[PDB]
Design a protein around this nucleic acid. Structure first.
Ligand SMILES: Nc1ccn([C@H]2C[C@H](O)[C@@H](COP(=O)(O)NP(=O)(O)OP(=O)(O)O)O2)c(=O)n1
Ligand SMILES: [Mg+2]
Ligand SMILES: [Mg+2]
Ligand code: NA
Ligand code: NA
Length: 326
DNA sequence: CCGACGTCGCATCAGC
DNA sequence: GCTGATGCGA
DNA sequence: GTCGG
């Protein structure tokens, strides 16, 4: 982090444009600028130096000159002092509250943590839980704890059916020394892109994890995606471990390589890879890479035998998980 | 200059 | 109920 | 907010 100051500022601006302006693209511009500056291995001495990097144009260059001359940014200073903006930025921090709900709550004079705690009747289910665990969700998970959770998830999965494969993804697979949450990709021979030969394949796993008091709550639940809460077990006299977000994704087993590429991220990396795919005339999702036809209707799934194949098709040198941290 | 810019799962709401 | 759009998050 | 065409 040769350029933490700069990338923080841009992240704050990305966050502002997302939560307050509801301008998703400006949010992307910023995340991207921040990303490209983050991997640039020099201490930036000027805005013009930055302007050079793809994704850094004029406005951001100007901001970078201001930031460097003064150590701060007047645009942000203002936004920080704005009441509506501080209020909306806060609320969206609660999981399940986005930009829209955040502005709606503010309108009704609900703007603090205490206002939320006293208005639980006005929150949907996701939002109630995000609020419940507001504090725990702010904390990072050390890898060491990620290893414990892994042991458990994989052992419980083994016990339900020995043919399940569960693979930890996200920032964990990218070798991070800490993670915001746990991401778990699931496969079972009975679920392929051809047929689902067995119902309740994700449910039986959620149930099992619930039954050992690992999954403590549910944010949302479908046939293929789970979003909920989990907690490591503590011993006698130990203060409890914090509650932690867990996402579980059941992917057809023959499409594992696309699923695992997707679920490994980063979010920015995925967006850059998919963008580049389209310029090469392909669309990648979590399932497949397909060609774009002459007018762009997506052709038939191309054969994929590893993560590398997907890189090959779009003419990208392979990148190990630890290098996809954009 | 000027749109074009990643892709999908689930929750929830509106209209029928 | 179904369809399709919007919100939110992966 | 940025940039390719
Ligand atoms: N907008 C997003 C968000 C996530 N994802 C994919 C890539 C992410 O690595 C993966 C898991 O989502 P995630 O948990 O929010 N992020 P990630 O695990 O990469 O970093 P952490 O905050 O978990 O430490 O979903 C995406 O493709 N587009
Ligand atoms: Mg994660
Ligand atoms: Mg996650
Ligand atoms: Na540039
Ligand atoms: Na939120």
């Amino acid at each position: 982090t040769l350029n933490g100051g700069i990338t923080d500022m841009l992240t704050e601006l990305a966050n502002f444009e997302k939560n307050v302006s509801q301008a998703i693209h400006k949010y992307n511009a910023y995340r991207k600028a921040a990303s490209v500056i983050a991997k640039y291995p020099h201490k930036i001495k000027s805005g013009a130096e930055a302007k050079k990097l793809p994704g850094v144009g004029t406005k951001i260059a100007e901001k970078i000159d201001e930031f460097l001359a003064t150590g701060k940014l007047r645009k942000l200073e203002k936004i920080r002092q704005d009441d509506t903006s501080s209020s909306i930025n806060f609320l969206t921090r609660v999981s399940g509250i986005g930009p829209s709900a955040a502005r709606k709550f503010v309108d009704e004079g609900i703007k603090t943590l205490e206002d939320l705690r006293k208005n639980e009747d006005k929150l949907n289910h996701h939002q109630r839980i995000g609020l419940k665990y507001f504090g725990d969700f702010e904390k990072r998970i050390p890898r060491e704890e990620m290893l414990q959770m892994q042991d458990i998830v994989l052992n419980e999965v083994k016990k339900v059916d020995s043919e399940y494969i569960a693979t930890v993804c996200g920032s964990f697979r990218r070798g991070a020394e800490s993670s915001g949450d746990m991401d778990v990709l699931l496969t079972h021979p009975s679920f392929t892109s051809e047929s689902t030969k067995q119902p309740k394949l994700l449910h039986q796993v959620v149930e099992q994890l619930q039954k050992v008091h690992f999954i403590t709550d549910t944010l949302s639940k479908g046939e293929t995606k789970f979003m909920g809460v989990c907690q490591l077990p503590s011993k006698n006299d130990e203060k409890e471990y914090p509650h932690r977000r867990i996402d579980i994704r059941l992917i057809p087993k023959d499409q594992y390589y696309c699923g695992v590429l997707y679920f490994t991220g980063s979010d920015i990396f995925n967006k850059n890879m998919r963008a580049h795919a389209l310029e090469k005339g392909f669309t990648i999702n979590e399932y497949t890479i397909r060609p774009l036809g002459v007018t762009g209707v997506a052709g038939e799934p191309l054969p994929v035998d590893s993560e590398k194949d997907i890189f090959d098709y779009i003419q990208w040198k392979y990148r190990e998980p630890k290098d996809r941290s954009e």
